Structures are given as structure tokens and as C-alpha cells.
């Protein structure tokens, strides 16, 4: 459990005091060696009016009311370049702080020590863990949380699943919206949850039939997960349905892949005549009687038999969705597209996930944002929604 | 050029095994779903087996259920036919095609191996 | 099981005559029926998908039209370089199987 370098313990009651548009908030706690000041806020119209959750089940289904009081986001005080995401609750506290380069992160414990019954923060800086036309700026995405990510990273509760969701896309969003694709203006083409589906139990499968949320793994039931290659196709080939309307679909689960992977997505391009990306492109098969879009995605949340930090897993949600963007695998060859560790370490679309080795690691490569500006002047006038939001 | 070379056919007897291969080239293999199709001497041709892109959906004709097997090795660049119990009537000659990325169809065939079984 | 069937199996034309190949299915196919075109000797070429679109290959004399479940299959001049035999396939269902064959030569 205890890898990294700084992991040092906080209490959410005694330690956050929580001091007070629409509701401000000025809450501040003794974290690592800072009296983290902050100042956040929150609003209805933050969420989208077509931002619908839904908890499935076997053949029922119901819908979660968000919390628009809940999710903030504003600036620490006396940093006006600081970025700084949160979302604070009665013990679910998720927290990220941006400024002087160094980030901090804040995370319940209860995800790392086996015991969900702990309460506790996990404040850490993620530098020391051991290893242009506006309007069609927004592609609308589905993410889906299967069983396995459900019952281990959200207690079995559908709130605090929700929450961590939408607290790391929009983390990924923040990620996506800073980087300009073409070194100029053309900056803020992210990501915008357009409906969440939440699966709370396996879902009961016929006898030599496939599901991706199925409590048993295609390959071989001896492993405890899916091959990644495999889950992905079976994902979308079940979602097809549910990712006709929407520009991506992904999902969200918690299985130790193989040799070390996490996520890996359908890889974009602006061809017309090639499917999987932004766009949902059809693509026939007789196998299901049904169309099969493949924008689709993966996003597993352990490695190696224990649960990744939010780090991680944002690193591995951006890359995934960094390959449905038409990005491809950074090339080993060159220092230009992925330099050594010492001159500020590896970017985004690495091989291989590296989590928060050096500050560019959630950053883009030219190398590989050149194919991300490739496909989306293609495929924004197809299949680019508004922002909706703020 | 689309060229999908095949290897594997011969004389061999009933209950043997084959494991003829489709060396596609010229395209990304690993997007493009792939069917075997076979044609008996002088006679219709039919559809045989179909998998998946990457390997999850793979299903056969009824006559080959339970004594075909067809997976792809998308590192080598290669598909693959392992069927094994063949009888007397397998004796067609085995076509590759790549089933159309979009739609429904086929754009790109093989050339075909000349199974013949017999003792 | 979809069972596919070609009239006429074996029919005769002129050079210029309007050849029509009718491929009747045993359901009601949507829209997914194709045709193929294989000279004895060769692989089969695909000519027409989706029962109304031409192949990118294909001369545009081959047309193609019917729904649901009467399927037709039209060339309206026959040059002597497209005298061999026609599948017609559908590609609804996972047993996906082809049509019988239908067989054109030229007529002295």
C-alpha cells in the first residue's frame, strides 16, 4: 500500500474546517506542509439538462439525482493562476490542487487499506510517487461503470461511483481543454458526460454467451479479468445501442489486466471510410443482427492487485480517450516525441503508463497531437455537440 | 494490393488436421473483420466461418460447428483455420476473405487452397 | 436459416441483350443482399453490396434493385468480358449463405 514517497495521513472532521455565483465557499485544512486556503464554488447550471444518470440493474433501472451543491471548482487565495477541482460530502472528499507546478491530491482511504469503513484523506504531490470555430467544442461521452468497478471503488453504493466519475472526467476534461492542437488557437476540444450508466450487479448470461459485465472472464475463467483487446470489442459490441447518440462510450472497470496494461481504445482517424474514433461511424455485423459503432473505450483501475491512485487513473483515462481522438502510441526512437525521464520525462501516449514521473506527463506530444488535430477537424463538424455548460 | 496469400491444403485422411493460414497484406488486418469460405469441386460456394476484428466473435456454418476453429494472431499478421475430425465432404477449395469494414460485404479474396481428403 | 435461391440457374444472351439475374430469399432481408462475380479459374469479385450500391471497381452497368424479399440483379449491355458465373449473397443473419449460381455463356 505504501509506495510512494509523501503519504501523508489527514482527518476529514477534525482538520477540514470548512469555513463559508450561487453558494462561495472559503473551506481550508492543515494538509502536508500548507494551510490550503481555498475558494470554490457551485451551481445548477454546471450540470447539463440532459445530464441523466442511470443505475442499471437486470432489468430495471432508476435514475440518481446529482447534487449540482456538491461538485466545486475555483482558485486557492493569493494564487489566481492556480486550477483547483473538488468535491466535497459528509466523508466523500476527492480534491485536486493545481499551482507552482507541483499538484496535490486528496483521495478517501478507504479504497487503498482493504477496509471501506475507514475515514480518511490521502494527501500526496503527484511529483514524488515512486515509479477554431467555437460552438461544435464539446464531444458528448458515455461512461459506463461495470459491475467489478461498482462493487470494489464504490462501496457498493452508487453515489460515491458517480462522484468519482464525474470528479476524474472532469479532471480529463480540464486536462483536454488546456491543450491547443495546432500550437495556435484551436484550443478546447474536450469531453462533456453526456449520460452515465451505472451497472450495480453482473449481469446473468446464458451459457456460452458473452457479456461485458458478465461476473467471469472471456478468455479463461483461471484469470481474474478480460483480455484487453477482447473486453473492448465485446463493450462495444453490447453498448452499440447506447453509443449511437453519443460521440464516445466508456467504460469503466476494475480487473488486473495482463502484463501490465490498463486501458486501450479504438484508435480515430479522419478517413471516411475508416470506423472507431470520435465519430460513431456504423460498421455492420451479421454475428448480433446489429450495427456496431466503434467509439468506444477502456479504462481498468488496478494494476498489480492494488488500486491505483486518481493519478493513474486520470493518466490512463486521458490516453485511452487520447487514442479514440486519432493519437497513436508515442515512438521510442525519437526524444522529440517522448524525451528521457531527466528533461521532464515521458508525455501522454507512452507505450507503457507512467503516472506522475515529471510534469509533462499530462501533456500531449506534438509527436502525437498532430493525428488529435488530424481527426477532430473531421470529425467536429459530424459529430461535435455545444458545451452546455461552464 | 490487397493480396491475401494462403498455404496449407493437401491429401490427407478422413480425421486428419489443417492449420492453412491467410497471409493478408497490404491493410490494417487488425480493423478488418475476415471470413473463410470454401467451394466444392465444380459446385455453389458457401460461407464457412466469420470472426471478429479482434478475435471475440467468432461463429461457423451448422455442417462445421463442433469441428472448426478459426483465430487470428494480429501480431503476425495471419489468419487461421485449425479444423480438425474432417470427413469426406470437406473436399472444396478453401477461400480468405476479408469481410467489408463497412456494410455487411466482402471486398478481398484469396486464392484458395485445394483441399482434398481421402484415403 | 436464411435459404437463398437464383433464377434462372442457366440462361443465354446476346452481346447486347439486358441480362436479369432474379435472387428470391426465404425472409425478408432489409437491405443487406451482394453479388459476386467469379470467372471459373479465379476468386470471386464482388460487384454490387446493399442490393442498390455499386462497388468502387466495378463498371456502372451493373445495377442493381428489390427489397425485402424479391432481389434483382441487372446488366444491361453484356460485353464479352463479364460472361461468368453470379452468387448472390445476404448478410442479415450469422448464417450467412450464398445463392446457388447462376451461369451466363454467349448465345450463337
Known amino acids: 500500500d505504501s509506495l510512494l514517497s509523501d503519504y501523508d495521513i489527514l482527518s476529514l472532521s477534525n482538520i477540514q474546517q470548512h469555513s463559508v455565483t450561487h453558494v462561495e465557499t472559503l473551506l481550508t485544512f492543515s494538509a502536508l506542509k500548507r494551510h490550503f486556503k481555498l475558494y470554490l464554488t457551485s451551481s445548477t447550471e454546471r450540470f447539463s439538462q440532459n445530464f441523466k444518470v442511470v443505475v442499471v440493474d437486470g432489468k430495471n433501472e432508476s435514475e440518481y439525482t446529482v447534487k449540482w451543491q456538491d461538485f466545486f471548482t475555483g482558485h486557492v487565495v493569493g494564487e489566481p493562476d492556480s486550477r483547483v477541482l473538488a468535491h466535497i460530502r459528509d466523508d466523500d472528499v476527492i480534491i485536486r490542487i493545481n499551482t507552482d507546478g507541483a499538484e496535490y491530491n486528496i483521495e478517501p482511504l478507504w479504497r487503498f487499506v482493504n477496509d471501506t469503513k475507514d475515514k480518511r484523506m490521502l494527501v500526496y504531490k503527484s511529483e514524488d510517487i515512486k515509479q477554431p470555430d467555437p460552438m461544435k467544442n464539446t464531444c458528448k461521452l458515455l461512461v459506463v461503470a461495470d459491475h467489478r468497478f461498482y462493487r470494489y471503488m464504490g462501496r457498493g453504493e452508487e453515489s460515491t461511483t458517480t462522484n468519482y466519475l464525474i470528479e476524474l472526467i472532469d479532471r480529463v476534461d480540464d486536462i483536454y481543454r488546456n491543450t491547443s492542437w495546432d500550437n495556435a488557437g484551436f484550443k478546447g476540444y474536450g469531453i462533456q458526460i453526456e449520460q452515465i450508466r451505472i451497472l450495480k450487479s453482473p449481469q446473468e448470461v446464458k451459457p456460452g454467451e458473452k457479456h461485458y459485465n458478465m461476473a467471469k472472464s472471456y478468455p479463461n475463467e483461471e484469470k481474474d479479468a478480460w483480455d484487453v483487446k477482447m473486453l473492448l470489442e465485446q463493450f462495444s459490441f453490447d453498448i452499440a445501442e447506447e453509443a449511437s447518440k453519443v460521440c464516445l462510450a466508456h467504460l469503466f472497470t476494475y480487473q488486473d489486466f495482463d502484463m501490465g496494461t490498463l486501458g486501450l481504445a479504438y484508435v480515430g482517424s479522419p478517413r471516411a471510410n475508416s470506423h472507431g474514433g470520435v465519430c460513431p461511424k456504423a460498421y455492420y455485423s451479421p454475428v448480433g443482427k446489429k450495427n456496431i459503432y466503434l467509439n468506444s473505450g477502456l479504462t481498468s483501475t488496478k494494476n498489480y492487485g492494488k488500486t491505483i491512485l486518481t493519478k493513474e487513473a486520470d493518466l490512463v483515462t486521458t490516453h485511452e480517450l487520447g487514442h479514440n481522438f486519432g493519437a497513436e502510441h508515442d515512438p521510442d526512437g525519437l526524444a522529440e516525441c517522448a524525451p528521457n525521464e531527466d528533461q521532464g520525462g515521458k508525455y501522454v501516449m507512452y507505450p507503457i503508463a507512467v503516472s506522475g514521473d515529471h510534469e509533462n506527463n499530462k501533456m500531449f506530444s506534438n509527436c502525437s497531437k498532430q493525428s488529435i488535430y488530424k481527426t477532430i477537424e473531421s470529425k467536429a463538424q459530424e459529430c461535435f455537440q455545444e458545451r452546455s455548460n461552464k | 494490393e490487397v493480396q491475401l496469400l494462403e498455404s496449407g491444403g493437401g491429401l490427407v485422411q478422413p480425421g486428419g488436421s489443417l492449420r492453412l493460414s491467410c497471409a493478408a497484406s497490404?491493410?490494417?488486418?487488425?480493423?478488418?473483420?475476415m471470413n473463410w469460405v470454401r467451394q466444392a469441386p465444380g459446385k455453389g460456394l458457401e460461407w464457412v466461418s466469420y470472426?471478429?476484428?479482434?478475435?471475440?466473435?467468432?461463429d461457423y456454418a451448422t455442417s462445421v460447428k463442433g469441428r472448426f476453429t478459426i483465430s487470428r494472431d494480429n501480431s503476425k499478421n495471419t489468419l487461421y483455420l485449425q479444423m480438425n475430425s474432417l470427413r469426406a465432404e470437406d473436399t472444396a477449395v478453401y477461400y480468405c476473405?476479408?469481410?467489408?469494414?463497412?456494410?455487411?460485404?466482402?471486398?478481398?479474396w484469396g486464392q484458395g487452397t485445394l483441399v482434398t481428403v481421402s484415403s | 436459416d436464411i435459404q437463398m435461391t437464383q433464377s434462372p440457374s442457366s440462361l443465354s444472351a446476346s452481346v447486347g441483350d439486358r441480362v436479369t439475374i432474379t435472387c428470391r430469399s426465404s425472409?425478408?432481408?432489409?437491405?443487406?443482399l451482394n453479388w459476386y462475380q467469379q470467372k471459373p479459374g479465379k476468386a470471386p469479385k464482388l460487384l454490387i453490396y446493399?442490393?442498390?450500391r455499386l462497388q468502387s471497381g466495378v463498371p456502372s452497368r451493373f445495377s442493381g434493385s428489390g427489397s425485402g424479399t424479391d432481389f434483382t440483379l441487372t446488366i444491361s449491355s453484356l460485353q464479352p468480358e463479364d460472361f461468368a458465373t453470379y452468387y448472390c449473397?445476404?448478410?442479415?443473419?450469422?448464417?450467412?449463405?450464398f445463392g446457388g449460381g447462376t451461369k451466363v455463356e454467349i448465345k450463337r
Open positions: 476473405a476479408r469481410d467489408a469494414m463497412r456494410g455487411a460485404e466482402v471486398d478481398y
Open positions: 497490404g491493410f490494417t488486418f487488425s480493423s478488418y473483420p
Open positions: 470472426i471478429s476484428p479482434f478475435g471475440g466473435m467468432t
Open positions: 425472409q425478408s432481408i432489409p437491405s443487406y
Open positions: 446493399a442490393a442498390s
Open positions: 449473397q445476404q448478410s442479415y443473419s450469422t448464417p450467412l449463405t
